[PDB]
Amino acid sequence: STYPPTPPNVTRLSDESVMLRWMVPRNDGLPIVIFKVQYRMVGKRKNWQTTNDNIPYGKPKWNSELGKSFTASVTDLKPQHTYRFRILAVYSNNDNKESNTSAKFYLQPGAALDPMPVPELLEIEEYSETAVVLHWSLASDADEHLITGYYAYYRPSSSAGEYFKATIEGAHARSFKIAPLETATMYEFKLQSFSAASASEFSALKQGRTQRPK
Amino acid sequence: LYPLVLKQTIPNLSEYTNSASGPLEGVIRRDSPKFKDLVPNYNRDILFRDRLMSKRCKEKLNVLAYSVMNEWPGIRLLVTESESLHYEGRAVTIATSDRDQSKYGMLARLAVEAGFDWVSYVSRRHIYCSVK
Numbered sequence: 001s002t003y004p005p006t007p008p009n010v011t012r013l014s015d016e017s018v019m020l021r022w023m024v025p026r027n028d029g030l031p032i033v034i035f036k037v038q039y040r041m042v043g044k045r046k047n048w049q050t051t052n053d054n055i056p057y058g059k060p061k062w063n064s065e066l067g068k069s070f071t072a073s074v075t076d077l078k079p080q081h082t083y084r085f086r087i088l089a090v091y092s093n094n095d096n097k098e099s100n101t102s103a104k105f106y107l108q109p110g111a112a113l114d115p116m117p118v119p120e121l122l123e124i125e126e127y128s129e130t131a132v133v134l135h136w137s138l139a140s141d142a143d144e145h146l147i148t149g150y151y152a153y154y155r156p157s158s159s160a161g162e163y164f165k166a167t168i169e170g171a172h173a174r175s176f177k178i179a180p181l182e183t184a185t186m187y188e189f190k191l192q193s194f195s196a197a198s199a200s201e202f203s204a205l206k207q208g209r210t211q212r213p214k
Numbered sequence: 215l216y217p218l219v220l221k222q223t224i225p226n227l228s229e230y231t232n233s234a235s236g237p238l239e240g241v242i243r244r245d246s247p248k249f250k251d252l253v254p255n256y257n258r259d260i261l262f263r264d265r266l267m268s269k270r271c272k273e274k275l276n277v278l279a280y281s282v283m284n285e286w287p288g289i290r291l292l293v294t295e296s297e298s299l300h301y302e303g304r305a306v307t308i309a310t311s312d313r314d315q316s317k318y319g320m321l322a323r324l325a326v327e328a329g330f331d332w333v334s335y336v337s338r339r340h341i342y343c344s345v346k
Binding site: 093 | 223315317320
């Protein structure tokens, strides 16, 4: 049998893009290989659009006592329109199962919205052979009440692929372990603060390597 | 080569556009001067739930027929229907002979591989394919 992802939750990233967050609940059904992301406009003549990314399930199997949570962006959206979003899981037998759809989400213009604080990203802690720890700071001014958390973007250095994303909740966080990562591998990392309504400019892009097996 | 998911389309764009199945045309009737061009497919390894199709439709439907059998030895392709291109013979609605809806995403991928110009995973019941 095959257990579906939860409906994605949406935050606005820019005038033309959003971040989606979902889970797969702990279950003994078939493994998921990838997820696909779909969106559709609420309104006229409207069909489901599929984005080009194949989001890999990754490892480990579960990242909590509840399931495994995932973060992914959808970009190139038309501003000032209402959308719905859903996630489709592809299983190890090549079948697929879609989440319930999100709530209607109006893509706001940024004029009424307040600038978010840009994290200042410190050197990447070369933590272990399979993990790295990001550290950052917030400028003195920063209205931390504005922040729900941080979105981290990372990929192998020089890779042309899309960034992987991860979510860390809590305005007060100032560090985050990214794991599991490939061993002896150079990654590039950038970080933004986010709220439901928006997200900061990016930190500097920082490079950091997992450890080399001795 | 991932299978398609529900509502996915390859190539990832509109049906009637260029890079896909190209433009719509004349709706073919019994009286139509076109009607003589719609060919029957008497491939024995394709199940029909109808036999009358366009020329390119047959070409690709035959490769897919033997591709299905190739991917799954002993399985057969099922054509369930032959304002879209159905009245022109240029679109098919398909499934598998064993009715394994879990294969449909895979079947969709096989229709792309088999060289259909535009494949659409329209429902859990069946896959839509078309040619230019």
